[PDB]
Design a protein around this motif. Structure first.
Motif, mmCIF file in Angstrom:
data_model
loop_
_atom_site.group_PDB
_atom_site.id
_atom_site.type_symbol
_atom_site.label_atom_id
_atom_site.label_comp_id
_atom_site.label_asym_id
_atom_site.label_seq_id
_atom_site.Cartn_x
_atom_site.Cartn_y
_atom_site.Cartn_z
ATOM 1 N N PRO A 163 0.797 -1.215 0.000
ATOM 2 C CA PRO A 163 0.000 0.000 0.000
ATOM 3 C C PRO A 163 0.833 1.270 0.000
ATOM 4 O O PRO A 163 0.324 2.339 -0.312
ATOM 5 N N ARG A 164 2.110 1.179 0.359
ATOM 6 C CA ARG A 164 2.941 2.360 0.426
ATOM 7 C C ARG A 164 3.711 2.590 -0.855
ATOM 8 O O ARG A 164 4.540 3.511 -0.949
ATOM 9 N N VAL A 168 4.170 4.379 -3.464
ATOM 10 C CA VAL A 168 3.669 5.661 -3.887
ATOM 11 C C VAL A 168 3.661 5.785 -5.381
ATOM 12 O O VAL A 168 2.788 6.453 -5.931
ATOM 13 N N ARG A 219 -6.957 18.109 -6.767
ATOM 14 C CA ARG A 219 -6.139 17.391 -7.711
ATOM 15 C C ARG A 219 -4.732 17.836 -7.457
ATOM 16 O O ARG A 219 -3.803 17.025 -7.445
ATOM 17 N N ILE A 244 -3.361 16.264 -4.372
ATOM 18 C CA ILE A 244 -2.873 14.922 -4.627
ATOM 19 C C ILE A 244 -1.520 14.940 -5.270
ATOM 20 O O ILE A 244 -0.624 14.209 -4.845
ATOM 21 N N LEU A 258 1.759 13.323 -3.359
ATOM 22 C CA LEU A 258 2.502 12.226 -3.921
ATOM 23 C C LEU A 258 3.949 12.608 -4.068
ATOM 24 O O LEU A 258 4.835 11.804 -3.778
ATOM 25 N N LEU A 264 5.631 12.500 -0.729
ATOM 26 C CA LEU A 264 5.806 11.116 -0.356
ATOM 27 C C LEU A 264 6.898 10.443 -1.128
ATOM 28 O O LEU A 264 7.572 9.561 -0.613
ATOM 29 N N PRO A 269 8.485 8.810 2.007
ATOM 30 C CA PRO A 269 7.472 7.777 2.103
ATOM 31 C C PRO A 269 6.981 7.537 3.528
ATOM 32 O O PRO A 269 6.010 6.803 3.730
ATOM 33 N N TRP A 292 0.312 10.698 3.675
ATOM 34 C CA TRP A 292 -0.442 9.560 3.193
ATOM 35 C C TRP A 292 -1.900 9.746 3.540
ATOM 36 O O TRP A 292 -2.791 9.517 2.717
ATOM 37 N N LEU A 329 -3.341 12.532 1.508
ATOM 38 C CA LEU A 329 -3.485 12.056 0.156
ATOM 39 C C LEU A 329 -4.793 11.333 0.092
ATOM 40 O O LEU A 329 -5.592 11.573 -0.814
ATOM 41 N N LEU A 368 -8.039 12.262 -2.224
ATOM 42 C CA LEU A 368 -8.576 11.264 -3.116
ATOM 43 C C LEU A 368 -10.031 11.035 -2.819
ATOM 44 O O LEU A 368 -10.862 11.002 -3.732
ATOM 45 N N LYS A 392 -12.229 9.143 -5.464
ATOM 46 C CA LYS A 392 -11.288 8.081 -5.718
ATOM 47 C C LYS A 392 -11.140 7.252 -4.474
ATOM 48 O O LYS A 392 -10.143 7.333 -3.760
ATOM 49 N N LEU A 432 -8.467 4.252 -3.989
ATOM 50 C CA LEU A 432 -7.227 4.930 -3.780
ATOM 51 C C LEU A 432 -7.169 5.610 -2.441
ATOM 52 O O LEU A 432 -6.127 5.569 -1.782
ATOM 53 N N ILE A 449 -6.457 2.943 0.046
ATOM 54 C CA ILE A 449 -5.093 2.482 0.005
ATOM 55 C C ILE A 449 -4.192 3.495 0.676
ATOM 56 O O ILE A 449 -3.321 3.108 1.453
ATOM 57 N N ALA A 450 -4.362 4.783 0.363
ATOM 58 C CA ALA A 450 -3.537 5.813 0.973
ATOM 59 C C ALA A 450 -3.756 5.860 2.480
ATOM 60 O O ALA A 450 -2.806 6.064 3.241
ATOM 61 N N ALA A 467 -1.886 3.123 3.829
ATOM 62 C CA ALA A 467 -0.469 3.407 3.724
ATOM 63 C C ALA A 467 -0.011 4.260 4.894
ATOM 64 O O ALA A 467 1.103 4.090 5.393
#
Lengths: 122, 98, 122, 98, 98
Positions: free
Chosen positions: A106-107, A109, B53, B56, B60, B63, B67, B73, B76, B80, B85, B88, B91-92, B95
């Motif tokens: 999941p990370r 990017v 947008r 995002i 990103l 990140l 990271p 995260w 983000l 999203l 989204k 996504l 997931i973020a 994350a």
């Protein structure tokens, strides 16, 4: 009739050539490593990477797919497959492949950035 | 002089002057593109202005430079989410937890 | 099903690549020459030389040993094996391999110099 | 000027002044490393002084430059013999005969 | 550096190392062609080695530089005598007396 370390020698040469950007040589070397023993996901993956470097992404797809067939947890292969599909305009597969990479990690990017674009391009 | 532009960015941001903060962060970043924190805060300023947008894109980038920023995260994921989204965003969000 | 001169073509290419320092290519070429006909001590030897050039002396040892299995009078292979063993810290084998090279050719001054050092390092 | 240093080396050597000969040969050799004969004679001077390790090192070097010098092969064998390196002394002695 | 080459020449000469002396004198002379004494001694070294033609050539050269060297005249006569050049040896011997 012997050559017990054949695949290893060819694999290592392939890695050296990949690192040096000599993708044509690397493809030959990885292909040979696999030709006599087509069971190394890493080599399938690196074969895909060399093909990806070459630009013939469709060949890269077959090689990366095989790497996943041998080992479906290769998130990086999932990612590059998504990239290959993306490049071909197949945004629907690009999405599926990037999502699989992200379920595994999941990370990632970059997979997220590319997934976002795939959904926008779709 | 990027360091001064950066500080103006933070001050304007904290004060709610997001339009000023955006220009100031962009100045600092133009001079120094690796300032992950500035990218993050730039994304936050865009988020505050409703441009999810851009938020995002900058989260990103922040990140990619860092990271480990769970807040980027998370934010983000928020941007999203705002854009619909949802897979996504999820997931973020995960994350950020990871 | 044919390719009557396959080994020769691959061997010659291997030699060209060895001469040009392209040891990775040379390894591939020598390996292929031998893969379909693993009976040329010269190719085993040159494969060993290319491996030796690469630095993976253990691979060089296997290849040189095979060259000796095909032809035990290859003093040079004996010498490089001794060098490979020496490099690995195996001074006892370095001694045995250098002595064999010298029985074949007592005037090999380099084998003598390296044998002297192997006895001192032992 | 290596040529003069060389001649001093030979003269000192013949006269038994091995310490002088050694320095003189080393001077000539520093200027011209390919003088196999000087390397040989340098090795002989060390041999005469009892340093059989140095004598070996120089005989080998002289032989690398000139593999035909049977006397260097022989003297190599002698220095090796002095050091107890008998298999090697034998090989060098045979090399001289070969 | 001719002066050092010269001294090596004399030392080698006195010690009987005529081959060394010859090379050393030639070095000194190459750098300084007017050293009549070195030419004389060079001729003597050749004489000692049996090369009486070279001894003549150098004695004559030494004499051209220094016509008073009775010993060069005498040794010229000796080298000539050795070569069977008797009228010449006699003249050179007389020249030494003159």
């Amino acid at each position: 009739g012997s050559m017990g370390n054949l695949a290893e020698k060819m694999y290592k040469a392939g890695n050296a050539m990949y690192r040096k950007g000599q993708y044509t040589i690397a493809i030959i070397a990885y292909t040979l490593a696999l030709l006599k023993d087509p069971n190394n996901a890493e080599a399938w993956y690196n074969l895909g990477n060399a093909a990806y470097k070459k630009g013939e992404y469709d060949e890269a797809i077959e090689a990366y797919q095989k790497a996943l067939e041998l080992d479906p947890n290769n998130a990086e292969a999932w990612y590059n497959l998504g990239n290959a599909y993306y490049k071909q305009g197949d945004y629907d597969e690009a999405i599926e492949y990037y999502k699989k990479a992200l379920r595994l990690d999941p990370r990632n990017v970059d997979a997220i950035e590319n997934l976002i674009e795939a959904e926008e391009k779709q | 002089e990027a360091e001064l532009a950066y500080l103006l960015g933070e001050l304007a941001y904290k004060l709610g002057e997001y339009r000023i903060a955006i220009r100031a962060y962009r100045i600092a970043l133009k001079r120094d593109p690796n300032n992950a924190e500035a990218w993050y805060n730039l994304g936050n300023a865009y988020y505050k202005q409703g441009d999810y947008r851009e938020a995002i894109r900058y989260y990103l980038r922040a990140l990619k430079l860092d990271p480990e920023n769970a807040e980027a995260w998370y934010n983000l994921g928020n941007a999203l989410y705002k854009q619909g989204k949802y897979d996504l965003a999820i997931i973020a969000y995960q994350a950020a937890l990871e």
